[PDB]
């Protein structure tokens with residue numbers, strides 16, 4: 332369920348650092364509500380301030396497939412402003428014994444600023460060339476906009492495919508030496524690059540995308556894995 336890599340891309344991947352994908356929970360991968368219409372995916376029972384509370388949790392469409400794929404490309408880290416008792420239980424259910432969401436950071440690791448919880452990425456990994464955050468609240472990565480992938484907030488829309496639409500970009504991004512080469516772009520000029528090093532990172536980024544676009548001109552077997560990838564990645 333992952334497109335085959337070219338010999339060039341595979342060699343490039345060995346020449347660059349391993350990368351971390353920081354993942355938010357609420358309105359990014361799940362949406363939940365407590366007591367006070369579709370059946371929830373799971374129900375958490377957590378006691379907070381010694382009062383028992385029920386949370387009905389809905390998974391964003393395709394989150395399990397999404398996590399299965401990106402866990403092959405990045406080290407996944409949960410960074411949430413929720414209380415550990417809640418965030419930890421959600422992560423346990425999301426991980427579902429796959430052992431990909433074992434590293435978590437909760438409210439006690441966020442900085443509060445102008446009513447927003449800031450998730451200081453350097454808490455997770457201070458080499459900012461090799462860390463990325465996927466979060467629906469831009470306030471959460473206010474201190475690291477160059478390392479952020481924004482995503483629409485999700486609450487219930489069953490037709491949402493945003494997690495699927497992120498997969499080829501997240502695939503291509505892991506071939507850069509510095510993720511900021513790509514994420515820092517996203518006023519009058521037409522320059523996407525400001526250095527030869529950034530330009531080389533965009534060449535690598537685009538090379539992987541090229542493998543997506545032209546995968547159908549490959550031999551039988553590679554072409555069959557391509558058709559599978561395109562039919563699965565909502566393209």
Ligand SMILES: [Mg+2]
Nearest residue numbers: 355357358467
């Ligand atoms: Mg959120």
